[PDB]
Design a protein around this nucleic acid. Structure first.
Ligand code: MG
Ligand code: MG
Ligand code: MG
Ligand code: MG
Ligand code: MG
Ligand code: MG
Ligand code: MG
Ligand code: MG
Ligand code: MG
Lengths: 140, 151, 126
RNA sequence: GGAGAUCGUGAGCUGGGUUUAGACCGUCGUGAGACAGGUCGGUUACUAUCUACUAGAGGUGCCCGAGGUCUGCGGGUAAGC
RNA sequence: AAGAGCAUAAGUCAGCCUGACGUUAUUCAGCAUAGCAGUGGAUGACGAGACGAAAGUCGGCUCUAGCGAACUUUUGAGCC
RNA sequence: CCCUAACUGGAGUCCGGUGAAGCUUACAUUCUAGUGCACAGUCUAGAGACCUCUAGGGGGAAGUGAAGACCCCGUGGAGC
RNA sequence: UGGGGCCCCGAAAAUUGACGGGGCUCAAGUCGACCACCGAUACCACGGAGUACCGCAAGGUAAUCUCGUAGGAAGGCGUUG
RNA sequence: GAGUGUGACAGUCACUUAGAUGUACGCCAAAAGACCGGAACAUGUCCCUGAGUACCGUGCGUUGGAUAUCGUGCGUGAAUCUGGGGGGCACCAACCUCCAAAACUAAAUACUCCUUGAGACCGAUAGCGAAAUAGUAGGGUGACCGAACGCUGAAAAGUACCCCGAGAAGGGAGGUGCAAAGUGCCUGAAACCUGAUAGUGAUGGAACGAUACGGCAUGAAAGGAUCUCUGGCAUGAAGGAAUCAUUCGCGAGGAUGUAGUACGAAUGUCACUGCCAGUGUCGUAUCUUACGUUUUGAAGAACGGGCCAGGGAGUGUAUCUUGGUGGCAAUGGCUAACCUUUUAUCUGGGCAGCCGAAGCGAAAGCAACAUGUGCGCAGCCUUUUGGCGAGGCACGACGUAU
RNA sequence: UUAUGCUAUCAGGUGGAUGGCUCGGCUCAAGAGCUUAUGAAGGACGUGCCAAGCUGCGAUAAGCCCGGGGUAGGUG
């Protein structure tokens, strides 16, 4: 802390000099006393007792990476500029297998004909893609 | 400490822009009559004796700051002398050649004068002690190797 | 300018920001316009809450040929489909390229003050 | 006669009792051990700085210089009961 | 227990019944002001009923006490 | 012991030499009463007090020795 | 006979001592009123300092700012490098 | 032009320094040769391919290892290519993957007795305990514990000669030295002690001081010279008389007028004067029972300090959170190890990874608003009352769990 | 002529702080990395003209011999 500010104040912003002694001026060490005298602090900070649920193995569980149809529609031209997609017959042919995204969600609007191929599309993503004239193809 | 590379490069570019400014360069104790920025033709790289460096600095109007560095170089006070820091030095002239040439050995012995290639142009050379306005001498080669130096 | 404004001004370390605040309160003095005093008070705020406007809000809440002053940086998350002039503190490169391809103009607070110190039609954003 | 003076008085004394460590008796407790129960035994440290008092001196103060003889502001007494 | 409530009754008797129902949201008060556990206790909602001509009443016994975290085990329905 | 006396040797007293230690925030010539954390040389109001030195024994400095060993407390120990 | 004011007896404590002391009697005590004066850093005034907020700045306002422990915040002095 | 020494600040006086050289024994070492040989093909009722081992039961330790770590105590214990093991409880099947129980193996890595370099390090009570006659003096039977002591001067030029003294002590006189700095000798503080000067002092009351006024001594420098002392005149805020007259009041006194007069802090100006500010001590008047701490409460007969000097207490790593200032900013931000070092800097790289970008749910799994609406501050416009209105507030709609 | 004393200053003594210097220490980095029965490290004792400690050396005892460097003084 500011050492030079408290040169002269004796207690150094600590009240009694009987304060600031050891673990007894904090109520134990670590996040201790969470069932007896730090119950409310345990509730406030998330230390509250209990176990809930289970975990599947990480080798089988997988967290897919997603992107919304609004993001694809409103920067598909940036995809064609970057080289990750091209334009055939006025329909922006965009593949999800190389952009790293594996699921498509229909958050937002679709305007241009996007021929989107990906691992799995949401139902509303399929709806918004097919309303605009594009198509969805599941890619192995 | 740590500075991100983008903001460190922005700091170095800010320092490089300060070398052109006459008010800050003359506001750092640098004594000279040249008109900033002092860019030189690339013959400066290949002169191999400090007398030629002296003649160039005299011709450019920069030898006064070299003399100030040499004759103001003064003993510091305290425990610095015992630990190896006897004199307290001055910064006068900074030469930036395009590549490793014998001007690096030439003006290496100029009093308070640092010479470095454009690659080794840290911000300390461009502004020692947090103050920008070093009296820097560039060449055409440093100018041509500087279009994307820090962007 | 009181002692609190002096504290907030001296706390800033950007010479451009302090010069902008001084010139803005001078302009609000001379032109009797609270637009420049308002931008000065916004710039004198904490720099952790400075404006950072994306292209989306400017596209959504504007019209053709609108004057925008954004005390902060203009970011580039979104699309612009009409010419808007944006006088802002700083520009992202993507936002600058977006406005340039959209036909808009991207100048600074000093340039917009010189263009028209009255500030008429200057809808401030955040 | 009674009572007060740190139940006056241990840098005055004594150490008999209570209030250490040992042991015995009785009573409690499974026990270690305990008893506002008893019994036997059981270390009293200090060169007085200041103050107070008791006596003995040296100075100055008062003052022609010195000596002698007195007075009595006061203090004390139980000088007897 | 104590205090409060109640008379064409919140009492007594008789007819028919099982609302002593599954699920779920708020706000109170334990904990005024003003954080604080599982719990209650008042309003509601979804689905089912009971009694009643209907309005209504019924989320036990007129209201306020009769009870207990995490972990663990057992059990109920269907799922991961 | 009533009830103390005299005497002897060593200390002490005085002198020459040698020569430490322990208490100590400061001042300090005190006495009474009150007040003040309810036990004051220093406060308040009075009364006394010229200063210095020597000897005396210990009234006071809640005299000095010493983070109470009795009692309590410590989510402190040890032995049994 | 009743209701009142002041005073008296009831009324004895331990180092000599406390209306603060001297002392005071149509008061220097008590009661009902009154006059004039004394007496603070309060109040008023003058000059000055600091602070709070506002003003671009000069500067403006403050009867409605100035005490301060635990503590928070801000600005400075000093040593060595 | 890194420094160090040199009778004081040294690029040019010396050692040096950048740079060139020499170098025996050893260390590495490529060309040029000799030495053994290696790799496939087809072949099949053929042969070999690690045992108290793999594995299993039970106990214990250990581990994050959970019915799913490794170890090993006891017991058991195989198969041989048509074979055996693994794929986080076991068994069956598919699929994938490997060959144990025998053995060797540089480099990248770790440490510092030692060598060299460097330092926002310490500067002698610090830094090693030791600026080393230091693990020494000293302490302990022993395991072991453990200091203090640095500085003459440029050059000894380290005091000749004489006197006192018993004196190779010491003192005076005298000299060397710019200077005694005169042998643990550079500067040389305070405590403590001795002497002198000033004030006071044997009639005197104590937190030792603060404020005002005087006596005595000082007041050279650094402080004043319209400054110090003493008066007149002008303007004078707040306040405001004395005396006299009238009238009231039992009286002390009040009211009215004189009079808001004369005066009055201070601000200017003119004479007048040479001291004043200050310092030391003493006296007089008023006020204060010290400091820190524990305390509801301290001068406490509560605790700490005899005095003086020096030393002596919010520091680092990792991690989480938030402020001030900045960089970059959904086409996001940062890079970590590491490479580049021309010796720790630095420049250019380093997309692994972390956070943000989509949440809800234990899990499978599913997956949203690029504003549909109302109000409205700053701000802009405006018949100055309204309009538009970023951010803000309140709904509506939607994702998912129950 | 007031002693014992009190306070302030000054001179001197005792003392060794402050200041200045420093061949030591600490920390970090870079190299190099074993030795010993062919008798080590460590220790005891001896060892100098006058030499007590430390250091070096071992009855050849602060030393002996040989090749290289250096060259005018040496005798820790
Ligand atoms: Mg507390
Ligand atoms: Mg006694
Ligand atoms: Mg105690
Ligand atoms: Mg407790
Ligand atoms: Mg405070
Ligand atoms: Mg050199
Ligand atoms: Mg040391
Ligand atoms: Mg307190
Ligand atoms: Mg100190």
């Amino acid at each position: 802390m500011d050492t030079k500010k408290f040169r002269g104040s004796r207690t150094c912003g600590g009240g009694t000099h009987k304060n600031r002694r050891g673990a007894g001026n904090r109520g134990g060490r670590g996040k201790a006393g969470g069932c007896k005298h730090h119950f409310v602090r345990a509730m406030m900070r998330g230390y509250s007792y209990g176990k809930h649920g289970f975990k599947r193995p990480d080798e089988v569980s997988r967290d897919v990476s997603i992107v919304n149809v609004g993001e694809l529609d409103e920067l598909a031209s940036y995809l064609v500029e970057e080289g990750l997609a091209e334009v055939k017959d006025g329909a922006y042919h965009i593949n999800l297998e190389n952009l790293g995204i594996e699921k498509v969600l229909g958050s937002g609007r679709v305007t241009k004909n996007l021929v989107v191929t990906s691992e799995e599309f949401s139902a509303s993503a399929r709806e918004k893609i097919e309303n605009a004239g594009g198509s969805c193809i599941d890619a192995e | 400490e740590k500075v991100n590379t983008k903001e460190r490069r922005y700091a170095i570019r800010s320092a490089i822009a300060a070398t052109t400014d006459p008010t800050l360069v003359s506001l750092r104790g640098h004594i000279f009559e040249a008109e900033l920025p002092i860019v030189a033709v690339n013959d400066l790289e290949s002169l191999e004796r400090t007398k030629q460096v002296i003649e160039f600095l005299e011709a450019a109007g920069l030898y006064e700051d070299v003399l100030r560095a040499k004759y103001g170089r003064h003993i510091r006070a305290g425990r610095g002398k015992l630990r190896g820091r006897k004199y307290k030095h001055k910064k006068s002239v900074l030469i930036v050649a395009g590549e490793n040439t014998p001007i690096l050995k030439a003006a290496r012995n100029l009093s308070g004068v640092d010479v470095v290639t454009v690659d080794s142009l840290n911000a300390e050379l461009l502004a020692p002690g947090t103050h920008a306005g070093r009296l820097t001498v560039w060449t055409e080669s440093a100018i041509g190797k500087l279009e994307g130096a820090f962007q | 300018m009181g002692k609190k404004s002096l504290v907030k001004l001296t706390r800033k370390t950007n010479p451009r920001i302090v010069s902008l605040i001084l010139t803005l309160k001078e302009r609000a003095n001379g032109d009797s316009a609270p637009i420049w005093k308002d931008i000065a008070k916004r710039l004198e705020a904490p720099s952790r809450n400075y404006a950072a406007v994306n292209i989306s809000k400017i596209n959504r809440h504007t019209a053709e040929d609108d004057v925008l002053l954004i005390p902060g940086k203009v970011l580039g998350a979104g699309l612009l489909d009409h010419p808007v002039t944006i006088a802002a503190l700083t520009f992202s490169d993507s936002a600058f390229e977006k406005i340039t391809e959209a036909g808009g103009k991207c100048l600074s607070l000093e340039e917009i003050m010189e263009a028209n110190p009255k500030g008429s039609g200057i809808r401030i954003f955040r």
